[PDB]
RNA sequence: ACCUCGAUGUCGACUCAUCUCAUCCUCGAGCUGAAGCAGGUUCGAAGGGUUCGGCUGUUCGCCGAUUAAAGAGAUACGUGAGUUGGGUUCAAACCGUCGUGAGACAGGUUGGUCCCUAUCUAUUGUGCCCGUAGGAAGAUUGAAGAGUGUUGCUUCUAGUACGAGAGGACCGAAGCGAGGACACCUCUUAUGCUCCAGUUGUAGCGCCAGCUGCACCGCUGGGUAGUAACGUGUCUAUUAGAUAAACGCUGAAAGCAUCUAAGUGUGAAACUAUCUCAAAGAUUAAUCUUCCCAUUUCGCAAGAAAGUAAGAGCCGUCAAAGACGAUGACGUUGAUAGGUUACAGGUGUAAGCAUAGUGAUAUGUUGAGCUGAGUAAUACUAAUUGCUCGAGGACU
RNA sequence: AGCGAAAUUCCUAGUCGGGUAAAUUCCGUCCCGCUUGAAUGGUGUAACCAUCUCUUGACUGUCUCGGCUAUAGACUCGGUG
RNA sequence: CAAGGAACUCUGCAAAUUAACCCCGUAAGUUAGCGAGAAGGGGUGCUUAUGUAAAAGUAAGCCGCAGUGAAGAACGAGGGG
């Protein structure tokens, strides 16, 4: 699905355009990062507006996987490109509004502030 | 690689102990007196009381 | 004795439905899905286009594509699944039982509706 | 390990089975190897059971597998199939051909066998 | 131990649904009433076991000694004969239906001979990574792995006993435990058990009470479809 | 300077490792300048793991981000009869230095051949013969064994015990993970070469239409069964016994005190099994059930020739197996394989025809036609009116 | 004179800035240049190099992580060896 | 060959992506010749009519996932020696 050193889109108003993976979190050698799993990442190129520019590193939550995973019910979610959402340390986001739909699986880990500020959910 | 000490005649004999060919089973045709193969036709043709080939 | 290999269908009769509409690749469809996260079941509507329909007697499944904010969404549904309902609103002309071209084209390429 | 014969190919197998079934339909008795005879028996049976209708569609459909022989041309075998082969089988389903096991040769000592039609 | 076992033939895999909107793939096993052949008395042979037979066939199709043995005890002529340790309380000449052993959702284990694989390398047998396919390969580039534990006459000359090597795979008796069976069919004589089931499609499969969790139940009841004309 | 010059192929990387404990982590416990979290140190413990990248030819070393940590080591500083060659280091040439010279300098600098078809041992799988004092078919027991042995996060008890605030548990319960292993392929993708449809060029089937050959399978889009993972389950747990360190009673040698001398206890991923796998070639050859048996009797009674009569083997159709052998089912008393019929799944409107257009084409006849290996019946075809070994149990 | 840790710099993994998450390699500078240096040439240079070196856009099994089919061998059988 | 797209490796080695024709459009630098086919894009099928002598080109219509349908035909931009 999502592997080490992966560039994906930015789906929130943080100023960045491309996000690159730094390392998957959890235990060592996880080798993958699925929906809802937090991952340390960095920015690649950003517009002058925004609270973050080139050079800094953050922790983000993956919200879009192209391969997709099968839910416990039987509905296997799919997406075309890959997106992510940025936070600072806490569950609160670093951006006001989020572009694009977000999966329901975040409810299994919290992040209700992210879903409450979305335009469409699964 | 190759052998480092020569193989004795005993070694080759024990190796070829399995060389003996099996005794192939035979069968007697029901109309042409001969010892043919098994499940197979003889030189005449009647694999059973039924033919297939002309003469050979 | 012996086995029939049709017992797969024989036992599967416990979970089945005979009210599923017919649709292959282009008919405009809608799915109503029920979610259970509170005391009240939440109802979500999902309109869009068909991608594939496949199954033998229980593996009958389909794929629905929609668009939102210029981003496409593919969702896979099991036909025989509680609290999932399907309906057809506008069927259309198709040339293949399975399509895969929508993964790179969106908009200005809608399926022409047949007679 | 370079420069290798093209060897046996899927297209080669199709050509071989077409040639063998055409030859069998031409003469009726063929001495060959056991494996190829067993492989071509399926196509022989399919062609014979398809020939039982004598309509344009199936006759077009059997042109794919057919091929001319030394003694009879393409149209010759095409007419022969529905003239003196298909009418001979109308009550017997399948089993229009059979194989018997010949002896092994001496040059290569392969497995040789004869293939014939139904009496 | 309360271990009890029944044989059957696993015939295919097909998922069924239930309440809570949860997905669970299921496998279908054609069951058959197994006849008791004997019981080893615990005091008589120092171990307790129950021997049964199944897959009945034509009486004359079996060999003479087994036919005579079944004639002596009036046991139905069968093709398969096997026993299970510590199975207690089942006298001879009795027929067993699968409803006497397991509840609707208690823990189960399933055993069967693994499906065949033929000869295979250590790559497909011990998860050994493939050698480098780029920047120079050498005509060997898919290899069993180095084995040498030393060079000389002090820690060498020996290849380790039973180290992973490219060998036979499959066609061996395996077992998977902690299984929750979900479907009974006495009117049709079939069972449906959750999870993947080992064994080739059409082989002999043995269903027993798992020793992992000694009989703890948690039912799973099916949910009937509600949408209809 | 002790074996090697009649050649024991050197650094590092990849894969594969195995072993010790001076323990990196989990675990047990003591002491504390240990209020509690987190700590510092001594002893026990080898069960498992011990990250990914940038610079780097490198091991290092530095750094970035995570984790339970990023263990110290050992084996011709393991692993070229497994891969390469980035280099000390070959023949070409640069510069710097040295030399009056050819030239030299771990001074740096660009390029640059890595041979070997397996004899014995060892190991991984797997067969034939013989033996187990009758023969054969089955089912067992356990002799000695092998593998599996990692933890995290969230919540509750509980903002409780603790500490003045800050801050924040031991002990337990539940859910969710990652890693690895065992399997399986219904659901998701991967492949799916006599499967389906579109399709260019070219040459044929005389020609139109339609089909074939060839152009990697001609290309493309899918896709049967089986094989596969990224997909689905389960496993990592639990308890019992004896113990390391540690913790104790009663009790004296030593009127006291005191875990030890006796008796009697607590107590760790270590250990024995509980889990899984195989196992009577366990010669120390085990147990049980069933089936076959009694032709006086003839050479030097020597169990000598009538000598299986149960079964097994030869050959064949085959795959649930499969390099070969085996294994498993079946040989006209039959469903073992092929063919036929029907259905499944896939492909998606076969070909001809009529209509509309003028013309490529569209519509209806058409949920049609097609389809290797899927499934159930079918003796239509192929497994024959063939051959060999094989019973009176030396004695208890 | 010019140039300068450059193919020349041993202490050097010299300072700083950059490009990256991290830069012994890279580029512009700084200069006790241990031993730079102007015909054994210095400096700059348009085009070119099966030249060396470094960043980077599309691209892909190089890789995370392996799998499937096909042939010809490899395996059995027959002839030579 | 799914997703990632050089994270492998001393080094994007190998392999893959741009390929044929026609039409737009093309920079630094310079010895003014070049760089340049730079870079970056667009159209190619069949039928009808317009069309020169053929092909061009044009407009309309039709088919499909794609239309030099396969085959054979440059991956580039930078700074340094
Ligand atoms: O000479 C060789 N090996 C010699 C044999 O006497 C010996 O093994 C050796 C190996 C390495 C070495 N060295 O690296 O200095 C010296 C001797 C090989 Cl290079 Cl052919």
mmCIF file of N, CA, C and O (backbone and C1' of nucleotides) in Angstrom, chain F residues 356-375:
data_model
loop_
_atom_site.group_PDB
_atom_site.id
_atom_site.type_symbol
_atom_site.label_atom_id
_atom_site.label_comp_id
_atom_site.label_asym_id
_atom_site.label_seq_id
_atom_site.Cartn_x
_atom_site.Cartn_y
_atom_site.Cartn_z
ATOM 1 P P A F 356 -35.924 0.640 -45.337
ATOM 2 O "O5'" A F 356 -35.018 1.647 -44.500
ATOM 3 C "C5'" A F 356 -35.585 2.496 -43.515
ATOM 4 C "C4'" A F 356 -34.553 3.443 -42.960
ATOM 5 C "C3'" A F 356 -33.473 3.869 -43.940
ATOM 6 O "O3'" A F 356 -33.884 4.928 -44.783
ATOM 7 C "C1'" A F 356 -32.461 3.167 -41.933
ATOM 8 P P G F 357 -33.333 5.015 -46.289
ATOM 9 O "O5'" G F 357 -31.849 5.563 -46.113
ATOM 10 C "C5'" G F 357 -31.606 6.778 -45.423
ATOM 11 C "C4'" G F 357 -30.147 6.938 -45.078
ATOM 12 C "C3'" G F 357 -29.162 6.647 -46.195
ATOM 13 O "O3'" G F 357 -29.051 7.706 -47.130
ATOM 14 C "C1'" G F 357 -28.432 5.591 -44.220
ATOM 15 P P U F 358 -29.742 7.573 -48.578
ATOM 16 O "O5'" U F 358 -28.548 7.143 -49.536
ATOM 17 C "C5'" U F 358 -28.598 5.930 -50.279
ATOM 18 C "C4'" U F 358 -27.241 5.278 -50.359
ATOM 19 C "C3'" U F 358 -26.728 4.709 -49.037
ATOM 20 O "O3'" U F 358 -26.093 3.422 -49.194
ATOM 21 C "C1'" U F 358 -25.260 6.435 -49.809
ATOM 22 P P G F 359 -24.749 3.152 -50.049
ATOM 23 O "O5'" G F 359 -23.572 3.712 -49.133
ATOM 24 C "C5'" G F 359 -22.223 3.350 -49.389
ATOM 25 C "C4'" G F 359 -21.303 3.739 -48.258
ATOM 26 C "C3'" G F 359 -21.565 3.090 -46.907
ATOM 27 O "O3'" G F 359 -21.055 1.771 -46.823
ATOM 28 C "C1'" G F 359 -21.160 5.407 -46.620
ATOM 29 P P A F 360 -21.424 0.834 -45.571
ATOM 30 O "O5'" A F 360 -20.290 1.152 -44.496
ATOM 31 C "C5'" A F 360 -18.932 0.826 -44.752
ATOM 32 C "C4'" A F 360 -17.991 1.677 -43.939
ATOM 33 C "C3'" A F 360 -17.957 1.404 -42.443
ATOM 34 O "O3'" A F 360 -17.145 0.294 -42.099
ATOM 35 C "C1'" A F 360 -18.123 3.732 -42.811
ATOM 36 P P U F 361 -17.257 -0.361 -40.636
ATOM 37 O "O5'" U F 361 -18.798 -0.203 -40.269
ATOM 38 C "C5'" U F 361 -19.253 -0.317 -38.926
ATOM 39 C "C4'" U F 361 -20.276 0.746 -38.615
ATOM 40 C "C3'" U F 361 -21.415 0.334 -37.695
ATOM 41 O "O3'" U F 361 -21.069 0.394 -36.322
ATOM 42 C "C1'" U F 361 -22.289 1.454 -39.584
ATOM 43 P P A F 362 -21.759 -0.603 -35.266
ATOM 44 O "O5'" A F 362 -23.241 -0.038 -35.099
ATOM 45 C "C5'" A F 362 -23.517 1.050 -34.228
ATOM 46 C "C4'" A F 362 -24.983 1.411 -34.247
ATOM 47 C "C3'" A F 362 -25.943 0.304 -33.830
ATOM 48 O "O3'" A F 362 -26.098 0.211 -32.424
ATOM 49 C "C1'" A F 362 -26.683 1.259 -35.856
ATOM 50 P P U F 363 -26.529 -1.180 -31.744
ATOM 51 O "O5'" U F 363 -28.070 -1.343 -32.119
ATOM 52 C "C5'" U F 363 -29.056 -0.471 -31.580
ATOM 53 C "C4'" U F 363 -30.398 -0.685 -32.234
ATOM 54 C "C3'" U F 363 -30.972 -2.091 -32.134
ATOM 55 O "O3'" U F 363 -31.633 -2.329 -30.901
ATOM 56 C "C1'" U F 363 -31.123 -1.338 -34.370
ATOM 57 P P G F 364 -31.480 -3.746 -30.157
ATOM 58 O "O5'" G F 364 -32.482 -4.707 -30.938
ATOM 59 C "C5'" G F 364 -33.885 -4.643 -30.722
ATOM 60 C "C4'" G F 364 -34.617 -5.629 -31.598
ATOM 61 C "C3'" G F 364 -34.116 -7.064 -31.529
ATOM 62 O "O3'" G F 364 -34.697 -7.783 -30.456
ATOM 63 C "C1'" G F 364 -34.317 -6.402 -33.792
ATOM 64 P P U F 365 -33.890 -8.978 -29.752
ATOM 65 O "O5'" U F 365 -33.980 -10.176 -30.799
ATOM 66 C "C5'" U F 365 -35.232 -10.768 -31.118
ATOM 67 C "C4'" U F 365 -35.153 -11.595 -32.378
ATOM 68 C "C3'" U F 365 -34.092 -12.683 -32.401
ATOM 69 O "O3'" U F 365 -34.500 -13.856 -31.723
ATOM 70 C "C1'" U F 365 -34.033 -11.470 -34.434
ATOM 71 P P U F 366 -33.471 -14.640 -30.771
ATOM 72 O "O5'" U F 366 -32.918 -13.519 -29.782
ATOM 73 C "C5'" U F 366 -32.527 -13.857 -28.456
ATOM 74 C "C4'" U F 366 -31.248 -13.172 -28.042
ATOM 75 C "C3'" U F 366 -31.344 -11.662 -27.817
ATOM 76 O "O3'" U F 366 -30.481 -11.297 -26.742
ATOM 77 C "C1'" U F 366 -29.714 -12.109 -29.459
ATOM 78 P P G F 367 -30.792 -9.999 -25.847
ATOM 79 O "O5'" G F 367 -31.384 -10.587 -24.486
ATOM 80 C "C5'" G F 367 -31.476 -11.991 -24.263
ATOM 81 C "C4'" G F 367 -30.138 -12.592 -23.907
ATOM 82 C "C3'" G F 367 -30.196 -13.960 -23.234
ATOM 83 O "O3'" G F 367 -29.072 -14.738 -23.641
ATOM 84 C "C1'" G F 367 -29.126 -12.414 -21.798
ATOM 85 P P A F 368 -29.244 -16.308 -23.946
ATOM 86 O "O5'" A F 368 -28.672 -16.483 -25.423
ATOM 87 C "C5'" A F 368 -29.544 -16.529 -26.543
ATOM 88 C "C4'" A F 368 -28.800 -16.286 -27.833
ATOM 89 C "C3'" A F 368 -27.554 -17.129 -28.048
ATOM 90 O "O3'" A F 368 -27.851 -18.414 -28.564
ATOM 91 C "C1'" A F 368 -27.081 -14.859 -28.540
ATOM 92 P P G F 369 -27.062 -19.708 -28.031
ATOM 93 O "O5'" G F 369 -25.644 -19.619 -28.750
ATOM 94 C "C5'" G F 369 -25.538 -19.646 -30.166
ATOM 95 C "C4'" G F 369 -24.226 -19.063 -30.627
ATOM 96 C "C3'" G F 369 -22.976 -19.692 -30.031
ATOM 97 O "O3'" G F 369 -22.582 -20.874 -30.706
ATOM 98 C "C1'" G F 369 -22.827 -17.340 -29.866
ATOM 99 P P C F 370 -21.979 -22.118 -29.888
ATOM 100 O "O5'" C F 370 -20.545 -21.610 -29.414
ATOM 101 C "C5'" C F 370 -19.549 -21.253 -30.361
ATOM 102 C "C4'" C F 370 -18.438 -20.459 -29.721
ATOM 103 C "C3'" C F 370 -17.665 -21.166 -28.617
ATOM 104 O "O3'" C F 370 -16.668 -22.039 -29.117
ATOM 105 C "C1'" C F 370 -18.251 -18.993 -27.901
ATOM 106 P P U F 371 -16.569 -23.550 -28.577
ATOM 107 O "O5'" U F 371 -15.720 -23.423 -27.234
ATOM 108 C "C5'" U F 371 -14.430 -22.828 -27.242
ATOM 109 C "C4'" U F 371 -14.092 -22.234 -25.896
ATOM 110 C "C3'" U F 371 -14.147 -23.191 -24.717
ATOM 111 O "O3'" U F 371 -12.975 -23.974 -24.585
ATOM 112 C "C1'" U F 371 -15.294 -21.197 -24.170
ATOM 113 P P G F 372 -13.070 -25.579 -24.567
ATOM 114 O "O5'" G F 372 -11.758 -26.031 -23.786
ATOM 115 C "C5'" G F 372 -10.865 -26.982 -24.348
ATOM 116 C "C4'" G F 372 -9.678 -27.217 -23.449
ATOM 117 C "C3'" G F 372 -9.994 -27.670 -22.033
ATOM 118 O "O3'" G F 372 -10.266 -29.057 -21.938
ATOM 119 C "C1'" G F 372 -8.401 -25.927 -21.964
ATOM 120 P P A F 373 -11.293 -29.600 -20.829
ATOM 121 O "O5'" A F 373 -10.529 -29.367 -19.450
ATOM 122 C "C5'" A F 373 -9.434 -30.195 -19.069
ATOM 123 C "C4'" A F 373 -8.980 -29.916 -17.658
ATOM 124 C "C3'" A F 373 -10.017 -29.253 -16.751
ATOM 125 O "O3'" A F 373 -9.866 -29.740 -15.421
ATOM 126 C "C1'" A F 373 -8.095 -27.890 -16.876
ATOM 127 P P G F 374 -11.157 -30.167 -14.567
ATOM 128 O "O5'" G F 374 -11.840 -28.780 -14.185
ATOM 129 C "C5'" G F 374 -11.534 -28.125 -12.964
ATOM 130 C "C4'" G F 374 -12.791 -27.678 -12.260
ATOM 131 C "C3'" G F 374 -13.845 -28.755 -12.062
ATOM 132 O "O3'" G F 374 -13.596 -29.548 -10.915
ATOM 133 C "C1'" G F 374 -14.855 -26.807 -12.948
ATOM 134 P P U F 375 -13.900 -31.124 -10.938
ATOM 135 O "O5'" U F 375 -15.471 -31.212 -10.688
ATOM 136 C "C5'" U F 375 -16.054 -30.659 -9.518
ATOM 137 C "C4'" U F 375 -17.548 -30.512 -9.662
ATOM 138 C "C3'" U F 375 -18.307 -31.769 -10.055
ATOM 139 O "O3'" U F 375 -18.555 -32.632 -8.958
ATOM 140 C "C1'" U F 375 -19.030 -29.962 -11.392
#
